[PDB]
Amino acid sequence: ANLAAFLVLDRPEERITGINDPRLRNPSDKFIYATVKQSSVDIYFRRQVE
Amino acid sequence: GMMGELLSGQADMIVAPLTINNERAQYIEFSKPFKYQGLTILVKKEIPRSTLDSFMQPFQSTLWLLVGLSVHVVAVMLYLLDRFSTLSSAMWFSWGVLLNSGIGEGAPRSFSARILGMVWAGFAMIIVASYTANLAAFLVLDRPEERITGINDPRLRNPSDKFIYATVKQSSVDIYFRRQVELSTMYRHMEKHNYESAAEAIQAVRDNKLHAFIWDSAVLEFEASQKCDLVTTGELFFRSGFGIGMRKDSPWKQNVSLSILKSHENGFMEDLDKTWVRYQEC
Amino acid sequence: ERPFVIVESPDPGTGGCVPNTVPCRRQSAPYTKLCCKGFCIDILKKLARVVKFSYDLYLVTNGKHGKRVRGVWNGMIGEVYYKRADMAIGSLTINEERSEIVDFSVPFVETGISVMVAR
Amino acid sequence: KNEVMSSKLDIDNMAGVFYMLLVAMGLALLVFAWEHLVYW
Amino acid sequence: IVTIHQEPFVYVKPTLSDGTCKEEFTVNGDPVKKVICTGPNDTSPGSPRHTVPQCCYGFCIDLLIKLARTMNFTYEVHLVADGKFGTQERVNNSNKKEWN
Amino acid sequence: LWALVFNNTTSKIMVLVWAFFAVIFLASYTANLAAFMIQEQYIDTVSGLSDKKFQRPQDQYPPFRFGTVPNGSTERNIRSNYRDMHTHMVKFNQRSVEDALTSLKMGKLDAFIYDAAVLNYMAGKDEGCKLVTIGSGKVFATTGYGIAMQKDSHWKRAIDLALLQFLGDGETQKLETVWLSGICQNE
Amino acid sequence: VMMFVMCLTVVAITVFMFEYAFTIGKSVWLLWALVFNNSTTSKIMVLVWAFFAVIFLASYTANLAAFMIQE
Amino acid sequence: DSRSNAPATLTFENMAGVFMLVAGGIVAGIFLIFIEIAYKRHK
């Protein structure tokens, strides 16, 4: 019974949600975000005020 | 009501669990809060059915007997192979090695018979291995078995006669649903089943007449942790405080609102908590 | 105080720092420019359009929050007891000693004393 | 709605183990006649 | 016509020394169509330049063909100079803002 | 029969039934204990200010190390009542939240004490989710933030009603979920 | 396959360390039978090899308890 | 396709840690059963 509890709580990965996850908003070091420079996206992220 | 007899002139002070909100803040002069709290739902417990019922949970009655019969065939599969090269005891040889006990007799002789017996033990091992696993996961995942949670599109959304939501007339909680137009559905039902005194409506939940009660969190936590057999569903969905009241233009306003603070520092308000709202658990 | 009232240098390109932010001088000739934002700030904005204010800011220096030192206060409570300001917002707590000399509003975020340890 | 536990009756899982189970008799069928010419 | 190297739409592949480019049919059996695309230095980050020929083929390039066979075009395809998709930025001297 | 029974005609049929009740019992045991240990709540050292390990620190092992950034407010509540706790609390941290947080991951101290609403935030976002508050959310001497205004002003009654408007309409809930949000919160 | 074959070696070695009685054919039945349950020369090895079954045979169970709960 | 079936398969590492136990059984006993045999047998 004690072996099984250890094997269950080795949860590998809960990677991400869409772009609303708290990993997104506060970018301390983890999960750095990178887009292609000068692209239509890099402007969309300068026009949204939120 | 009670707020009236202060504004009319019948008394000079109101020491009771009075909340703090805009409407009453026009006409009365409150004090610094002396307790924080929220709003939460009270519901009747759901029974933890039994052991005898759970002991057969992964016994889904389909393989439970498909194996209950196939134990017999190997018994008549060996002696009918042994008589061709005893039988009554072979029927006592399966139900032993299956249950792994040492309750048996002489072993099969033929080399073919040795091969036959051996696999039966192998089959047996996997069964009990499967059983002890499926029961465990049946115990972790079937944890909640709970009633409605906080108000995030539960049965609260449809005012069917399956659920009944109640409050106490002439309260903040009552008003709080009226001004909220986003919850128009939630109120049109609530009118039909409101009660008159917070104490009598608690009784209704212990009587299978009323399914859900939406009231304060201070009074309604002691009420559960002390009486018994009642539980409060989840977190709280609003945050407010209590406070002394007094008419506009009072001299005491500045002074009493110090004592309320001066006592939060001296651990006083802490022990009054430890006196008769805690240490009374079921 | 990092989660409530943040300070940040202005955008060197645009010149006047990003909208949704409030410019905030720093008490001390070249008074250095840097603009503030955060939770407690976002209160007085929404509070300005309901009671019709107009407001400046300035980060106090002499003392952190405010206590008594041999009969004179420092910090934010200093800047209100001595007629050098009209409010003092941010991470400020209510208690008895303060509330004898300077009025207070109704608590809009609750707090207390707490203890933190390792896992 | 509150029915989650998912007690499993996997008759094919069962039919899985029954593969090496019943062919054990199929190992005897091939060892039933293999002894008759052997005992003779 | 100008273009840009993007994986599932238009490909860039070196030319065979014989001037042409390799012609391997599709799975459907029909011959793949490809056109000679001139373009950049063949090594973008650091070099003066090397305007060398290539061979391109892909989704858009095919849509370029059928459109052409209904308009009587004649096209010379060349990759874009600096790879970037394109945006407008306020350059030094603050006077004019051009589309990079 | 029972000796025969515990793990090695109408006489033999019953001890069988006992042998049966073994695997049903045992498997049920090892299952139950699994769910019980798969419940993740573990005791944390102290259980309040009133505790001994805080009050009389003359224990044999060195006391819990008491960090409070001084000259603040939590000080003026501790010094006022707990004379012994304070006179032990001159060994502290002085670089506020940053000093306390690093000094605690690296064993430089063992306990920290500060304003409640920033602690259960800073512990909200933290690499690996490796910090907690021993109160399990408990708070002591509970008060709240405010807006200090000059004594007997005429501004008070106005913004005193524009505040009770915000809390009473959930517009302050939109803010609280934008600036006070953690990953480690719901885990 | 490793457990299948690495089992098959203690089948071989043990009859070598016991033949120098136990029938050559016979030794094979007991060991598999051992790892499956049911039946200083013979003992020393069969003792620890017996638990060796109990060690992993019990982890298999523990493993299924994960494969049935994290799905 | 997308699957991510089974959050494990028991590694060929821990079983080696189990395999190491029986290995010590194979290596140890013989040396004792052979070398010490010379002593208790003759005298």
Ligand SMILES: *[C@@H]1O[C@H](CO)[C@@H](O[C@@H]2O[C@H](CO)[C@@H](O)[C@H](O)[C@H]2NC(C)=O)[C@H](O)[C@H]1NC(C)=O
């Ligand atoms: C609130 O409490 C204070 C402190 O006790 C009161 O101030 C005292 O009032 C009496 C009444 O005449 C004076 O004789 C004292 O001199 C005051 N104290 C000081 C330190 O000067 C105050 O009066 C109380 N409020 C009301 C409305 O009575």
Ligand SMILES: *[C@@H]1O[C@H](CO)[C@@H](O)[C@H](O)[C@H]1NC(C)=O
């Ligand atoms: C804290 O207050 C003391 C007493 O006035 C002062 O000496 C000290 O500089 C203040 N700041 C720190 C970080 O200790």
